Amino acid sequence: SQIRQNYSTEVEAAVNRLVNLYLRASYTYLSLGFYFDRDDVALEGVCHFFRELAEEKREGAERLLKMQNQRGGRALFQDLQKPSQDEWGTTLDAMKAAIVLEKSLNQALLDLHALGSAQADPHLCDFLESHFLDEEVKLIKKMGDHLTNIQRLVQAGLGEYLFERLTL
Amino acid sequence: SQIRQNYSTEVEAAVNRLVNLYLRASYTYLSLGFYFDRDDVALEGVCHFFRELAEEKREGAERLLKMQNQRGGRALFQDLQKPSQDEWGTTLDAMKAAIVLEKSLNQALLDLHALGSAQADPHLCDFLESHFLDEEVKLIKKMGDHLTNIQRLVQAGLGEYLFERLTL
Amino acid sequence: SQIRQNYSTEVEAAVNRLVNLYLRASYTYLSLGFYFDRDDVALEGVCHFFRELAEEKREGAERLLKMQNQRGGRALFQDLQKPSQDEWGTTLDAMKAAIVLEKSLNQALLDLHALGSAQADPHLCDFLESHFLDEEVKLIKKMGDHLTNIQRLVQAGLGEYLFERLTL
Amino acid sequence: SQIRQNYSTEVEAAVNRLVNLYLRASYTYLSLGFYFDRDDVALEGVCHFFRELAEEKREGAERLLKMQNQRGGRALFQDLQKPSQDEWGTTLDAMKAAIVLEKSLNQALLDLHALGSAQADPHLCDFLESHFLDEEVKLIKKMGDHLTNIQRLVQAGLGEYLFERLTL
Numbered sequence: 001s002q003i004r005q006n007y008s009t010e011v012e013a014a015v016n017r018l019v020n021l022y023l024r025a026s027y028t029y030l031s032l033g034f035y036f037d038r039d040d041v042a043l044e045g046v047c048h049f050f051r052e053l054a055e056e057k058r059e060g061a062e063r064l065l066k067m068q069n070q071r072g073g074r075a076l077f078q079d080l081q082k083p084s085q086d087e088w089g090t091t092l093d094a095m096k097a098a099i100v101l102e103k104s105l106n107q108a109l110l111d112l113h114a115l116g117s118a119q120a121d122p123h124l125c126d127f128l129e130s131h132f133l134d135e136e137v138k139l140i141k142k143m144g145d146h147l148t149n150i151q152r153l154v155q156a157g158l159g160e161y162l163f164e165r166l167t168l
Numbered sequence: 169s170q171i172r173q174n175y176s177t178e179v180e181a182a183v184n185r186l187v188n189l190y191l192r193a194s195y196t197y198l199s200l201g202f203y204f205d206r207d208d209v210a211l212e213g214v215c216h217f218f219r220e221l222a223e224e225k226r227e228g229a230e231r232l233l234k235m236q237n238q239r240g241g242r243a244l245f246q247d248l249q250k251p252s253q254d255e256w257g258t259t260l261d262a263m264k265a266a267i268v269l270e271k272s273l274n275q276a277l278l279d280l281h282a283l284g285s286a287q288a289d290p291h292l293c294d295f296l297e298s299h300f301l302d303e304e305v306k307l308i309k310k311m312g313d314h315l316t317n318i319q320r321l322v323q324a325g326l327g328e329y330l331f332e333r334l335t336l
Numbered sequence: 337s338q339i340r341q342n343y344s345t346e347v348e349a350a351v352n353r354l355v356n357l358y359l360r361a362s363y364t365y366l367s368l369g370f371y372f373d374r375d376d377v378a379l380e381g382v383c384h385f386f387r388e389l390a391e392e393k394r395e396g397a398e399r400l401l402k403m404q405n406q407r408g409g410r411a412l413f414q415d416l417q418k419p420s421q422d423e424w425g426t427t428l429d430a431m432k433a434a435i436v437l438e439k440s441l442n443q444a445l446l447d448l449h450a451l452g453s454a455q456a457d458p459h460l461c462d463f464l465e466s467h468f469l470d471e472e473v474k475l476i477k478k479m480g481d482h483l484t485n486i487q488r489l490v491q492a493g494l495g496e497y498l499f500e501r502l503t504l
Numbered sequence: 505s506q507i508r509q510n511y512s513t514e515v516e517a518a519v520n521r522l523v524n525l526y527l528r529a530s531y532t533y534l535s536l537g538f539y540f541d542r543d544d545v546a547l548e549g550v551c552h553f554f555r556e557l558a559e560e561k562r563e564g565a566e567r568l569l570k571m572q573n574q575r576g577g578r579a580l581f582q583d584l585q586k587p588s589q590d591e592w593g594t595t596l597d598a599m600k601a602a603i604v605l606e607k608s609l610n611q612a613l614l615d616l617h618a619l620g621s622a623q624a625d626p627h628l629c630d631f632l633e634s635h636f637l638d639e640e641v642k643l644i645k646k647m648g649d650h651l652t653n654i655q656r657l658v659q660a661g662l663g664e665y666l667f668e669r670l671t672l
C-alpha cells in the first residue's frame with residue numbers, strides 16, 4: 001500500500017476482528033429492540049433504547065472501517081453470528097445482557113489499545129481514545145444506573161412499567 | 169346504473185352489511201366512551217381512547233358508503249343493534265371486548281376481500297387494502313400492546329389509574 | 337398470539353428468511369462501499385452509491401421485522417453470511433454483482449407475494465406491493481441504466497473515472 | 505525558565521528541528537504551486553491544491569513554535585533549504601513528490617512522539633496526537649486517492665486536464 005506507514009499486520013487484523021464484534025453487537029441490539037416491540041412484551045421505551053444502541057454500534061463499525069482504509073489496511077469481513085438469545089426475558093434480564101455485551105466490547109478496545117501501544121502506533125491509540133473508550137465508559141455507567149433503578153423497582157410488573165414510562 | 173361496471177350484486181350486498189357492522193362498532197365505542205366518563209368510573213384517558221375509536225369507525229362506514237355510490241351500488245341501511253353490554257367493567261374488560269370487536273371487523277374485511285377476489289373486482293380489493301386492512305392490523309397491534317401493559321399492572325386499582333395516566 | 341389473525345406459519349417463516357436476505361444484502365453493499373473507498377481504488381461516487389444501498393436494505397429488513405410483530409409473528413434471526421467476495425474488481429464488475437443481488441431479492445419478494453396469495457393473506461400482499469416491489473423495479477432499472485453507460489465508456493481507466501465523476 | 509516543567513532538552517531540540525522541516529515543506533509547496541501557475545504548465549486546480557498545502561505546513565510550524573514557548577522551550581531557527589527541484593514535471597510527478605514529503609513529515613512526527621513517550625512527556629504526546637498525527641494520516645489518504653485517479657487517467661494530456669478540471 002502506497003500510503004501505509006507504521007501500521008502493523010497485527011493491528012490491521014485486530015481492527016477487522018473488532019469490526020466483526022461491533023457488527024455482532026449491533027445485531028444483538030436489533031434483536032433486543034424487536035423483542036420489546038412484541039405485542040406480548042410491549043415496552044416501547046425499552047425497544048427504542050436498544051434500537052438506538054443498534055444504530056450506535058453499527059456506526060462504530062463503520063468508523064473502524066473508514067480508519068482501516070485511511071491507514072492503508074484492508075477490510076476483511078466474516079460471518080455475523082446470530083445473537084445468543086431468541087427471547088430476552090424481562091427488562092432486567094435484557095439490561096444485564098447489554099452490560100455483559102458492552103464490557104466485552106470495552107475489553108476488546110482495551111486489548112487493541114494495548115496492542116497499538118506495544119506496536120508504537122500512536123495514531124491508533126489516539127483514535128480509540130477519541131472515539132470509543134470514553135463512549136463505552138459513559139454507556140456502561142448509564143446501564144449500571146438503569147440496572148440499579150430496575151432492581152430497586154422489582155410488584156415486578158408495576159416496576160417494569162414504571163421504569164419504562166418514567167426513565168426510558 | 170349508467171356507471172356500474174364489474175360490480176357484482178354479491179359485493180354490493182356485502183358492502184351494505186359491512187357498513188352496518190362499522191356503524192354498530194361506532195355505537196359500541198360510543199357506549200364504552202360514556203361508561204368511562206361515569207362519575208363512579210372516572211377514567212378520562214380511557215373515555216377519550218374509545219370516543220376517538222367511535223369516530224374512526226363512523227368515518228370507516230362513510231367511506232364505504234361513498235365507495236358504494238362511486239361504483240353505482242345502492243346503499244341500504246338496517247337497524248343498528250344496541251351494544252352487547254350496558255356496563256363495561258374494568259379497563260381490562262373493556263380492552264378485551266374492543267379487541268374481540270376489531271377482530272370481527274377485520275374478519276369481515278378479509279371475507280369481503282375474498283369475495284372481491286373471487287368476483288375479479290380489483291378496484292374493491294385495492295380499496296380495502298388501501299383504507300381498511302392496514303388500519304385494522306395497526307389498531308389490533310396497539311390494543312394488544314395495551315392489553316399486555318394493563319395485565320402487567322394488575323394492586324388492581326393503582327394499576328388501572330397508572331395506565332390511564334401514563335399510557336392513555 | 338392474542339393479535340394473530342390470518343397469518344400462516346409459512347408466511348411467518350418466509351418473512352424471517354427474507355429479513356436474513358435483506359440484512360445479507362446490506363452487508364454485501366457495506367463491503368462494496370468500503371472497497372471503493374480503498375486508496376488503491378479511490379472512486380468516491382461509487383463508494384457513496386453502495387453505502388446508500390446498504391442503508392436502504394437495512395431499512396427494508398427493519399420494515400419487515402416491524403410488520404412481523406404487527407401481525408403477531410415472531411422474529412427469528414440467523415447468521416449473516418459474509419459477502420461472496422472480498423474484492424469487487426471494477427465499477428463494471430461491481431454493478432453486475434449488484435444487479436444479480438437485486439434480482440435475487442426481487443425473486444424472493446415475488447415468491448413471498450405468491451405464498452401470501454395462495455394463503456389468502458391480502459395484508460401481506462399489499463405490504464409487499466406498497467413498500468418493496470416498486471422500489472426493486474425502480475432500483476433494477478437504475479442499475480441497468482448504469483451498466484449500459486459504464487459499458488459504453490469502456491480507454492477503460494478514463495471511462496471509469498468519467499462515470500464516477502459525471503453520473504454518480 | 506520559570507515555567508518549564510517536565511520538558512526535556514531532547515524534546516526542545518527535536519521540536520526546533522520539526523519546525524524547520526515544516527517550514528521547508530511549506531517552501532516546497534510554494535515552489536510546486538507556482539510551477540503549476542506557469543503559462544506553459546497552466547493547471548490552476550493543481551496550483552491551488554499546492555498553495556493551500558503551503559499555507560497548512562506554515563500554520564503547522566507556527567503551532568509548534570507557540571507550543572515551544574508555552575512549555576518554556578526556546579525557538580531556534582536554521583536556514584531553510586531550497587526545495588529539491590526547480591521544475592516539477594507532470595501532476596503525477598508532483599503528487600508522488602508530495603506523498604514522499606508527507607511521509608517524511610509523518611515519520612518525523614512519529615519519532616517525536618516516541619521521544620516524548622520515552623521522556624514521559626504526556627503533554628507533548630497529546631499535542632502531536634491532537635494537532636498533527638490525524639491531519640497527516642487524512643492528507644496522505646487524500647494524496648494516495650489522487651495518485652490512483654491520476655494513474656487511471658494516463659492520452660496523458662487529456663487525463664491531466666480532466667483530473668485538474670473534475671477532481672481539483
Ligand SMILES: CCc1cccc(CC)c1O
Pocket residue numbers: 023026027030054055058359362363366390394
Ligand atoms: C443496524 C442493524 C444491522 C445489524 C446487523 C448487520 C447490519 C448490516 C449493515 C445492520 O445494518
Ligand SMILES: CCc1cccc(CC)c1O
Pocket residue numbers: 527530531534558559562
Ligand atoms: C507559506 C510560504 C512560506 C514559505 C517559506 C517560508 C516562509 C516564511 C514565513 C513562508 O512564509
